[PDB]
């Protein structure tokens, strides 16, 4: 082929020297060329380049101020040179330009928006002093999607927030919340919005780090009862703000208000006599033993010791000393001592659901678990009373008919004991070693639940196939037992329910091989059934159950990367539940003229410190040894031209 | 027919990428079958060559490994290839390596070969499939959107 | 505390201005400050900055040769200044210094060694031109004797020194990497440093070989000193980077091969079908039509492969019931007569390769000891079968034979023998591009499992000892026609040490029940202790040891899989090179230099002089190439301004 | 204050014993990261640079007489037994110290070593 | 012991100053040195 030049022209033969004059820099020639071309001398001072650079767009490129002044002295077309100067980060050029179809920017980018994009303090200052106004975010779909993302990038710049916002803390919490929600309804631009939200969360952390005394810290968190803004930082999920070392040293002094086996004994001793402290809190709460259960650390231990005693009662309900077999029995001695705890739990949930009735209540795991456990306990209590008034009398247990209330009540009560002892897991966030382990093991669980939409599909398909094959050979002659839960397993694939039960117990290898035979000499269907069972055993344990452990490893690294701010956030949430008054008794029992000026002064000092730190962290860094070399020759140049 | 519903997972923002990444770490498993199929064939040949002299079907209603009293496990090549496949899941008992004779030398050799097959395929061959699938998922997740 | 300056003597008054003028580059100030010739106002020209720097050394670090020459003309003490200039890589300073107690360098360091360490082509050339010599690498103050030895081996193993003062840079890069590899095993402390010096010698040969411009020069190197005589030397020295180069690999593939997925397997099978035709064709008339068609390595490989699948096919047919019932001491069947030629060919090949290498680097390979064991088993099978025939006769029921009968032992050994034969078919995966790298990496992830076998073999022994000690007093065999764990009612799992060892092995796979821990007595304390020890053994092995064997086979598939294409290609080259010569072109069934030196040394100079150029003119650029642009502009401006006035 | 006391250029300049004052200053900075767990990554990172200072200072030995004098200051190998009590892992695992320890310890190929090992082990009562 | 320790400290400082001054910061010093030398020569010429 022959390579040619398509859709292009030539610039000039005399304007090349004029452009090279400003490319290298020489006042004499540059001035002369412009001066001699005053009376229509056909030089086209508004030149062009193969790169598309006009004369003005070249002096600004090299930042030479004298050349810019000389060019702007004459009548030269500027076009969009202001935006180029703003993007190039030249303060002198924009200062000169402020007081004085083909474009490289979309026709919506105003100078203020571009300056906010560049995130420069001085240029934004100059533009705001002149007077600007960004629009308010709220046919041409492509235009409209690159017209709200540009606005939110300008609004989320730290330099603009710290300069034209009454309260940078509030405007950082709410802005990151709006951006986070916008990332959902905007699936195409998901990565861009989520990065802005993480940008706004670090701004509050950086602004909080500029506190040099505990007095200044308490004025920020308690603004507008106690720790009022610290609770607001949790409603907006500001994990970085909460997990600041100062905000964690302050909370520790309110919480606590030594070797391991000098503290374990102390904890067990202080939890040994919780009823004494609870009684003293209600009979003589003045100093000695009435406000000793008011320290949050002691209150946490007392509440834990009551929960451990509740579990110890559930483990004594199965003892034989505490038991005849009669229909509708009277409640035993243990159940009367268990009833107060259940009533306390239900009442505590009732007096905590009023903040929002199912509104953000059922969002976390533990609230749903508590709701299920309380429903099960209510059903047990209802059934045990239903069974008392009608189904009374003494009769051997083996002669009872199924669905008897005394059996369903016991089954529901036994199911609810599992959830009661699994609530003891949530008390691990308070420990330094077992704390981060629980959070990592609880966030590496939404991935597991995504494999159970493929495993269930495979199970359903294979169960349907096996049942369709084997359902014609059902037999029930000379059999006391019928199912896979017998000594001699039979009828494993005779129905869809038993088929679904058999293909689940084969994961653990509890299904024998002879269940694939029939009471006939049909040796072709037996081989097909065995092949189906073997194929299921192949892709359930080698393929599908090895890709589950292969993706846990590649998602645990991401979770464990930032897994210490989350544990501290969870621990702070747990701690702050024991600070407020109300609910200080265990389940066994209980059944602005000023202050707006100091805050402003502290906030302005914080903003001053933040800007004085950001300018030095951005200007200096390896760029400090570049401006020095300019000065080194500038001083010599001035000295030389003084003598010349 | 019911296994084509997984092809509709490429419409959900959560189950979508999982299916695509799951079907890409599957040509690696296919390359690993060519070694297991050779080890299985070698050990089946050895076990059948040792045990084919002791076949018997006297006074037994069933014959093979798929009945309650497993017998004639290594009498032919088909039953030997089936017996070494079900031993991965532990569904083959240990009394199938016996004969109706007092030949303890051949029984010990058969048991040793069965144990050697168990070691190779369960702790040396199924731990290299995990190790090489765990180091191949990271590349698939770099370009999965 | 009241911090003070301890162990520091002083400085002087005047010398500070001297050093400041030297550092700032003021020529006139230093010139007048040096003019106290032989009448000095107590100003020491050998003053030492508290940091150790001297005026001569300061000028070296600023490479201002005017002050350097002025100081040299004034007889300033030099000391170890040449070494500093060499390390700083200043050509002019070395040039000037070459024509004329606290030390910063080790006492055994010489300028040539330091220059070789810095790898500077110009300084090395200048030093060699004047006449130098490295000591002989070839015990009282062992600290400096081991340090001196490492200094000289680091100088010799340098690309710039090797290709300026070596007769054959290709041959000296092979012996040097080999010697440094075996020198890292006698010096365990400095192991990490010797084996890195060896790695840069292997890459030097590959880089030098990569400068070939056409196939004419490439084949001149590989054939130096019968054919491909310098490609068998690289394999002998394990130069994996040199061998696995695209230019060499393409030549090897052209020599080997001499189509799509569905069109290649079918024709390979078709060619393999007529295996016995073009072997007798070669035997009778070695002509270009058929006799020379087996001489193509790709065809010989297929014929030698299709001749092995035939061995396995009738190996599977030797156990069919159709083909010598239960007769004591039988005559060989119709299949083993067909088996005998292949076995005899394998044994003859092993015998002929035994004396060709002298059991050194021959038994040192994974795939060459399995062959020895297999052939020993095949020989013992015959040795027992012939003994059975000559001393036994008569048809006797099999159930009545006494144990250790020669027939049973012979057939057991034969059954064990033909497992290795089928497992040796694994070594034919290196020829495939898909299964090749996978198979090579699997065999290197298996020498780490062998280390996770001294922990398990000790845990097993420790627990078996305790279990046998507990349970050896309750053994019984009355009312039991069957004894041992290998029956339908396991009864004596932990009675003897031999039984205990093999009862804790099957428990890993879950084939040992729980009632084996009971006794025929109501001693619930002993039974509970035995069950607790069995459970503790199950926890340690199946949860701890076997979950960290997979966790250390995952931090060893990131290093092995890092460089896997080189290892696979080296193995494939070693496989290909065995089908190039004459002598082995017979399946076991059918087996029963004045001008050359001139040309070589002429192309070698071109290769070396291209490598040095492509090294210097790439080390210069690899930000640095534009730093000298500003200095060039400054020098031009200075010269112009000075010359104008 | 601890970030200043643990600077290599100040220990060298104004300490009587840069070895001893780097063992102590790294032990305190490790047990102080447990009482100040809020500032934990800053107190233990400050302790990991005090272990490398001693290693880099011992790395400057030139002969086997200088190395022998240091390790036997204040019976034998007194300084090395002190560096073990403070858990100085980088100080002990140095090629020169390891070479000296091996020379004191031992005072061939794979197939020739275990043979004489068993030979010596058989006659352990003799 | 003191005689050995003084040498150890001195040669540790001599190496740390090298590794800090040199380590492309070395290239920036040479440019400034050339500029200063040119400036001084020009000032001393006129
Ligand atoms: C599905 N099936 C099956 O039901 N029965 C029982 C039927 C009677 O009850 C088998 O005996 C069987 C089988 N498959 C087999 O051969 C494999 C083995 C493993 C495979 N794969 N992966 C792994 C992965 C990890 C560990 C082990 C294996 C595989 O690939 C596959 F298609 F994906 F299954 C195919 N055999 C063995 C056999 C018997 C007779 C003959 Cl003539 C030929 C083969
Ligand atoms: C292959 N085999 C086998 O078939 N039977 C059944 C025959 C009887 O029916 C065994 O009983 C047996 C065995 N091997 C054994 O001892 C081991 C075990 C594991 C080793 N290694 N690794 C692993 C890795 C992962 C899981 C399990 C094991 C190992 O490693 C070695 F020392 F290098 F050989 C040696 N025993 C037990 C025994 C019997 C007699 C004696 Cl005197 C000594 C020991
Ligand atoms: C060793 N043993 C055992 O032999 N028998 C059988 C004896 C009779 O057949 C047990 O029944 C048993 C047990 N151990 C137990 O409790 C654990 C479990 C796991 C532990 N550890 N790790 C792992 C690791 C991975 C997976 C599983 C477990 C552990 O160790 C501990 F951490 F120190 F506690 C202790 N029980 C159950 C039991 C019975 C009676 C009582 Cl009163 C209390 C408990």
């Amino acid at each position: 082929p022959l390579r040619i030049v398509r859709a292009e022209s030539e610039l000039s033969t005399q304007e090349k020297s004029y452009l090279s004059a400003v490319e290298k820099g020489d006042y004499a020639s540059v001035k002369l060329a412009l001066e001699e071309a005053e009376i229509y001398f056909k030089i086209n001072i508004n030149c062009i380049d193969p790169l598309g650079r006009t004369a003005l767009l070249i002096a600004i490129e090299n930042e030479n101020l004298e050349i810019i002044e000389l060019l702007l002295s004459f009548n030269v077309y500027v076009g969009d040179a202001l935006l180029h100067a703003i993007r190039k980060e030249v303060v002198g050029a924009v200062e000169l330009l402020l007081n004085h179809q083909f474009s490289d920017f979309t026709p919506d980018i105003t100078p203020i928006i571009l300056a906010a994009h560049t995130n420069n303090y001085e240029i934004i200052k100059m533009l705001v002093q002149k007077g600007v106004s960004v629009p308010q975010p709220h046919v041409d779909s492509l235009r409209h999607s690159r017209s709200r993302l540009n606005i939110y990038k300008a609004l989320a710049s730290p330099s603009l927030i710290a300069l034209s916002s009454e309260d940078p803390f509030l405007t950082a919490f709410q802005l990151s919340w709006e951006l986070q929600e916008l990332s959902k309804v905007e699936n195409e631009f998901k990565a861009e919005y989520e990065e802005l939200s993480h940008q706004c969360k670090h701004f509050a952390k950086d602004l909080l780090d500029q506190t040099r005394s505990s007095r200044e810290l308490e004025l920020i968190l308690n603004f507008r009862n106690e720790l009022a803004r610290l609770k607001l930082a949790i409603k907006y999920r500001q994990k970085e703000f909460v997990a600041q070392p100062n905000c964690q040293q302050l909370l520790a002094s309110r919480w606590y208000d030594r070797h391991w086996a000098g503290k374990l004994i102390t904890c067990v001793f202080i939890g040994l006599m919780f009823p004494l402290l609870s009684l003293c809190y209600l009979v003589a709460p003045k100093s000695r033993y009435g406000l000793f259960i008011r320290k949050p650390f002691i209150k946490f231990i007392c509440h834990t010791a009551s929960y451990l005693t509740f579990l110890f009662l559930l483990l004594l309900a199965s003892q034989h000393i505490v038991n005849p077999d009669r229909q509708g029995p009277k409640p035993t001695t243990v159940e009367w001592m268990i009833l107060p705890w259940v009533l306390g739990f239900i009442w505590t949930e009732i007096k905590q659901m009023w903040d929002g009735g199912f509104q953000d209540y059922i969002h976390d795991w533990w609230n749903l678990m508590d709701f299920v456990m309380n429903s099960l306990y209510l059903a047990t209590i209802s059934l045990k009373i239903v069974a008392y008034v009608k189904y009374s009398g003494c009769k051997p247990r083996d002669t009872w008919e199924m669905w008897h209330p005394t059996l369903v009540a016991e089954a529901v009560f036994a199911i609810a004991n599992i959830f009661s002892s699994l609530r003891l897991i949530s008390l691990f966030t308070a420990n330094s070693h077992l704390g981060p382990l629980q959070i990592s093991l609880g966030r590496m669980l939404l991935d597991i639940l995504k494999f159970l939409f493929i495993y269930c599909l495979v199970l359903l398909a294979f169960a349907n196939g096996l049942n369709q094959l084997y359902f014609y050979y059902e037999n029930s002659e000379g059999m006391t037992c019928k199912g896979i839960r017998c000594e001699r397993q039979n009828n494993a694939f005779s129905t869809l329910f038993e088929t679904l039960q058999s293909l689940f117990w084969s994961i653990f290898g509890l299904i024998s091989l002879y269940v694939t035979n029939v009471k006939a000499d049909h040796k072709f269907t037996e081989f097909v059934g065995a092949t189906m069972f073997g194929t299921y055993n192949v892709i359930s344990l080698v393929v599908l159950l090895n890709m589950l452990i292969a993706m846990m490893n590649n998602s645990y690294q991401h979770i464990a990367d930032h897994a210490d701010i989350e544990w501290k956030f969870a621990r702070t949430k747990l701690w702050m539940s024991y600070f407020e008054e109300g609910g200080t008794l265990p389940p066994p029992f209980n059944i602005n003229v000023r202050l707006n000026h100091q805050y402003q002064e502290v906030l302005r000092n914080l903003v001053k410190r933040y800007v004085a730190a950001m300018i030095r962290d951005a200007k200096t860094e390896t760029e400090e040894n570049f401006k020095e070399l300019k000065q080194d020759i500038s001083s010599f140049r001035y000295e030389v031209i003084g003598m010349m």
Side-chain angles (χ1 to χ4, degrees), chain A:
Chain A
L2 173 60
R3 289 311 196 185
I4 64 177
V5 186
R6 61 100 183 265
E8 271 296 332
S9 178
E10 203 71 19
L11 162 62
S12 179
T13 179
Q14 291 292 338
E15 306 171 2
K16 180 173 56 60
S17 60
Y18 164 81
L19 291 184
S20 181
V22 309
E23 282 284 316
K24 286 187 174 182
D26 191 6
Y27 218 70
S29 182
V30 174
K31 169 63 143 299
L32 246 171
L34 291 166
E35 270 189 336
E36 70 94 28
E38 191 276 332
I39 172 62
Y40 196 67
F41 253 88
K42 271 286 193 300
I43 208 58
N44 186 22
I45 60 179
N46 307 267
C47 293
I48 205 58
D49 242 3
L51 298 321
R53 296 164 51 186
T54 70
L56 185 50
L57 299 181
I58 292 177
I60 301 180
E61 214 92 342
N62 236 126
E63 305 172 16
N64 226 256
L65 249 56
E66 303 291 342
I67 307 301
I68 293 178
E69 268 275 356
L70 179 116
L71 266 60
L72 293 183
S73 61
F74 297 95
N75 298 17
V76 183
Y77 188 72
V78 286
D80 301 329
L82 176 61
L83 277 67
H84 285 283
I86 290 178
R87 187 179 60 187
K88 271 292 301 178
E89 292 276 22
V90 189
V91 184
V94 63
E95 172 66 282
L96 293 178
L97 289 172
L98 281 179
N99 305 276
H100 180 253
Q101 166 60 220
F102 180 76
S103 60
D104 300 3
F105 302 97
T106 62
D108 40 65
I109 294 177
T110 58
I112 172 64
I113 298 178
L114 183 57
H117 282 39
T118 58
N119 191 27
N120 196 18
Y121 192 84
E122 302 201 33
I123 298 182
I124 290 177
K125 242 288 193 60
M126 296 165 54
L127 291 184
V128 170
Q129 287 181 1
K130 170 62 182 180
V132 294
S133 175
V134 324
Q136 166 64 27
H138 191 184
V139 182
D140 198 315
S141 181
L142 182 55
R143 275 246 309 175
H144 194 275
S145 297
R146 196 113 262 192
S147 183
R148 67 187 311 182
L149 186 58
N150 275 11
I151 294 180
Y152 279 111
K153 288 197 301 179
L155 250 46
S157 57
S159 179
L160 186 63
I161 295 181
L163 190 57
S164 61
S165 173
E166 63 268 24
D167 200 332
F169 273 136
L170 278 179
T171 54
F173 295 160
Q174 302 162 339
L175 192 59
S176 61
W177 179 265
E178 181 176 359
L179 294 170
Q180 192 69 29
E181 274 203 316
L182 229 57
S183 61
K184 306 192 311 300
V185 277
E186 200 62 33
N187 317 92
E188 330 299 333
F189 298 86
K190 179 194 176 185
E192 307 239 344
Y193 276 112
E194 288 189 346
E195 178 170 322
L196 292 179
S197 301
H198 191 77
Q199 170 182 305
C200 298
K201 299 186 186 305
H202 282 183
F203 172 65
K205 163 69 176 301
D206 295 359
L207 191 59
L208 183 65
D209 292 359
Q210 315 296 339
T211 58
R212 305 180 182 181
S213 62
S214 60
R215 166 192 166 274
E216 298 182 4
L217 186 64
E218 297 174 355
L219 264 57
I220 303 298
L221 306 181
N222 300 15
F223 176 65
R224 198 184 198 275
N225 199 325
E226 292 289 304
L227 305 176
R229 185 162 295 274
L230 183 58
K231 299 202 293 274
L232 185 63
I234 299 188
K235 272 184 63 270
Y236 280 96
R237 264 156 292 277
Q238 302 287 331
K239 292 184 175 58
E240 286 75 10
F241 183 88
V242 177
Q244 220 266 326
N246 302 323
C247 296
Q248 299 298 142
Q249 186 181 9
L250 176 63
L251 289 176
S253 299
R254 287 172 165 261
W255 177 254
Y256 294 100
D257 212 331
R258 190 186 300 263
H259 56 291
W260 69 274
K263 196 61 173 299
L264 178 139
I265 297 181
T266 309
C267 291
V268 69
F269 171 71
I270 196 62
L272 187 67
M273 48 259 300
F274 71 92
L276 193 149
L277 301 185
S278 301
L279 290 174
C280 293
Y281 174 82
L282 215 57
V283 305
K286 317 97 60 180
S287 66
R288 37 239 59 180
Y289 311 104
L291 300 187
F292 205 85
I293 200 180
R294 297 247 65 179
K295 300 180 179 60
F297 180 65
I298 304 301
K299 181 188 302 179
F300 167 78
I301 299 179
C302 294
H303 279 244
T304 298
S306 294
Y307 202 90
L308 290 182
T309 309
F310 176 62
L311 301 183
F312 180 74
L313 288 176
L314 295 179
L315 296 180
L316 285 187
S318 300
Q319 301 297 319
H320 299 146
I321 48 179
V322 190
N323 258 321
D325 289 317
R326 52 164 296 183
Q327 303 180 80
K330 220 170 300 302
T332 58
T333 169
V334 173
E335 203 268 358
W336 290 118
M337 302 184 62
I338 292 185
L339 184 59
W341 265 276
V342 181
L343 295 181
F345 294 152
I346 297 178
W347 175 236
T348 301
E349 292 295 339
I350 290 301
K351 70 159 55 180
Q352 185 208 315
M353 207 179 64
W354 59 23
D355 276 316
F358 312 100
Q359 305 283 262
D360 202 4
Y361 180 89
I362 311 186
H363 214 190
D364 41 356
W365 184 14
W366 303 114
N367 265 20
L368 184 58
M369 178 172 296
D370 293 326
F371 181 69
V372 175
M373 173 174 51
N374 294 133
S375 303
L376 291 179
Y377 274 141
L378 288 175
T380 295
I381 295 184
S382 300
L383 286 176
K384 197 162 183 187
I385 284 298
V386 166
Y388 180 83
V389 296
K390 304 179 183 59
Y391 301 87
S392 59
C394 298
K395 203 161 66 64
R397 173 171 283 262
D398 53 74
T399 55
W400 297 359
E401 72 284 350
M402 55 180 301
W403 304 115
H404 188 66
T406 321
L407 300 175
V408 186
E410 290 186 19
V412 176
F413 181 65
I415 294 179
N417 289 14
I418 297 181
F419 288 104
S420 298
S421 300
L422 290 182
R423 262 280 296 178
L424 205 62
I425 296 289
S426 60
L427 302 183
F428 278 162
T429 64
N431 198 277
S432 299
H433 311 95
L434 306 178
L437 185 63
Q438 172 201 352
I439 273 73
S440 301
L441 269 56
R443 197 164 298 268
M444 198 171 49
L445 239 171
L446 289 172
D447 309 333
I448 304 178
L449 266 52
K450 253 142 62 178
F451 243 73
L452 271 51
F453 274 98
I454 312 175
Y455 170 78
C456 280
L457 169 68
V458 175
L459 167 61
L460 177 63
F462 275 87
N464 179 27
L466 279 174
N467 176 240
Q468 180 68 65
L469 178 58
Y470 265 106
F471 93 104
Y472 258 122
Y473 295 88
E474 178 171 5
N475 65 322
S476 179
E477 82 298 334
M479 296 180 180
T480 64
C481 196
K482 173 185 176 62
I484 59 185
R485 285 180 276 107
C486 314
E487 295 192 45
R488 198 249 183 269
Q489 302 177 357
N490 59 87
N491 296 321
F493 312 103
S494 168
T495 184
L496 187 54
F497 202 47
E498 275 285 347
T499 310
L500 284 169
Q501 294 186 30
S502 302
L503 293 184
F504 165 80
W505 288 112
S506 62
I507 310 298
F508 320 99
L510 293 179
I511 295 299
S512 295
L513 243 181
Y514 57 83
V515 304
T516 58
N517 288 13
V518 294
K519 191 211 170 189
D521 211 336
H522 300 178
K523 299 169 61 179
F524 172 73
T525 57
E526 298 178 0
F527 193 82
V528 177
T531 302
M532 291 182 177
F533 187 54
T535 303
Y536 173 78
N537 278 272
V538 163
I539 45 180
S540 115
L541 289 157
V542 170
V543 171
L544 222 58
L545 247 52
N546 279 12
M547 298 170 176
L548 182 69
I549 102 180
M551 80 173 191
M552 292 185 187
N553 291 253
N554 294 275
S555 83
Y556 180 85
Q557 305 171 357
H558 304 350
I559 291 182
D561 195 317
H562 48 61
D564 216 63
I565 55 177
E566 315 219 355
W567 166 64
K568 291 175 182 180
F569 188 69
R571 191 178 64 171
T572 50
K573 292 197 302 180
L574 179 134
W575 282 6
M576 295 217 310
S577 61
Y578 297 88
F579 282 168
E580 298 296 332
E581 305 174 7
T584 168
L585 282 180
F589 298 88
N590 66 76
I591 195 61
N592 293 327
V593 180
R594 53 195 57 183
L595 265 53
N596 212 336
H597 267 68
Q598 298 182 106
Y599 180 82
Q600 288 289 343
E601 177 189 14
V602 172
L603 196 56
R604 94 151 60 96
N605 290 19
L606 262 54
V607 172
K608 183 187 304 177
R609 294 164 181 171
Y610 178 76
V611 298
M614 71 176 294
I615 61 117
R616 309 194 197 285
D617 271 330
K619 180 205 62 176
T620 300
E621 193 276 329
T622 326
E623 214 254 0
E624 51 174 334
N625 42 87
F626 159 74
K627 298 300 186 64
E628 171 188 354
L629 203 53
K630 309 173 70 66
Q631 159 88 185
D632 290 356
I633 91 164
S634 301
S635 61
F636 174 55
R637 169 174 184 181
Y638 277 149
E639 176 66 39
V640 164
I641 68 179
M643 307 165 53
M644 289 296 185

